[PDB]
Amino acid sequence: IQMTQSPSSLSASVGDRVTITCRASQDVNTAVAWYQKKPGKAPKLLIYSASFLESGVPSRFSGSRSGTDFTLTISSLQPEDFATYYCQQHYTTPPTFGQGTKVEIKRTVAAPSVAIFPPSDEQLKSGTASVVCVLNNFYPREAKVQWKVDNALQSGNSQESVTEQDSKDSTYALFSVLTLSKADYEKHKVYACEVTHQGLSSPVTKSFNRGEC
């Protein structure tokens, strides 16, 4: 029995009405539970037997069934409700889970601050050069970082990582790393990170000159 869960993710403000759906591939009667999972934390049971609120869990959470379709509703989103939600059928063995729904907190657009860092003296001594671009305190998550070396657009030699939403202001941070051998690094002068974002009226570039203090 399959559990198809929609949507994969959603943004919402405190007080909103949020709806998550799960469709079983076949009948599972009312044998359905909803779980909340926060990163690095144990799954927590919210709703059992499709419609019943687990003792202790806030009243805003509710579940419903109609045929093969199951719906998890949060009537009024409180700040601590930010998490990932999973449906589960336990009608047959094996019990199976939905792919999850990540609920994130909606906020006003914020442009990223940008910083660029040359490789450390220490790393260069080892024969490798990691150039790093940091994007801070921005929203929404979608951002484009574009490495340029002597105005030559780079491809397939950087990796990036984005943080989860900040606890206090709900922004993201992004780290982008361009790693070159010391030999390749020293064949070029100007290293640049170009940032495109919704909060930027035009792409922002930070750059440095190789070797300048």
């Binding site: 144990a42 910083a115 220490e122 790393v177």
Partner: protein
């Protein structure tokens, strides 16, 4: 209060064996079913096995039948997952739960890999109103690494990225913090990096 605590996780060679334990408190496992559920990177939640400790009856997911064994010792109020012929696909956080699954443990991490432990190099991201400075934590295995600033005294504004797997099969992450520009010539900033799997602790001073 009902509690479940998993242990036994760690780094294991493919084809090897590893035994996880799930210690129960505040209830007797004789009265319930105990389950193992796992969360492999990007695979969601996957049920692994269940046992009824009173009669020892067991069920398994098809993917682990035969090569995993779940068991229980009621006199220890503890259940177990014996994992054999371990595969890369078995790399996951393993949770215990009981019967809806109303209580879960915090999980225990299992990493199935032929790679050796390796501690990170830690490199400064040195500062050029406000300023950003940080550290780059590069070339470690396995996850996880923890990062603090000034031995935990500096928390506000600290942002630490998830790890990235490099083409070399080694992890890297970075952490950055925004500080007052006026603080730069006088306030000491140190990133404290711990990598328990290799017993590596590095405290790196970041200077302008």
């Amino acid at each position: 209060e009902v509690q479940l605590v998993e242990s036994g996780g760690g780094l294991v060679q493919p084809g090897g064996s590893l035994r996880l334990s799930c210690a129960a408190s505040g209830f007797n496992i004789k009265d319930t079913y105990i389950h193992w559920v796992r969360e492999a990177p990007g695979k969601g939640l996957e049920w692994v096995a269940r046992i009824y400790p009173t009669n020892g009856y067991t069920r398994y997911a098809d993917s682990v039948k035969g090569r995993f064994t779940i068991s229980a010792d009621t006199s220890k109020n503890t259940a177990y997952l014996q994992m054999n012929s371990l595969r890369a696909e078995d790399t996951a956080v393993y949770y215990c739960s009981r019967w809806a699954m109303d209580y879960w443990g915090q999980g225990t991490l299992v990493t199935v890999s032929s790679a050796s432990t390796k501690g990170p190099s830690v490199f400064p991201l040195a500062p050029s109103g406000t300023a950003i400075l940080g550290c780059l934590v590069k070339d470690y295995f396995p996850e996880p690494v923890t990062v603090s600033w000034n031995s935990g005294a500096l928390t506000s504004g600290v942002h630490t990225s998830p790890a990235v797997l490099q083409s070399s099969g080694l992890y890297m992450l970075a952490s950055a913090v925004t500080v007052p520009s006026s603080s730069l010539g006088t306030q000491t900033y140190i990133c404290n990096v711990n990598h328990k799997p290799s017993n590596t602790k590095v405290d790196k001073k970041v200077e302008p």
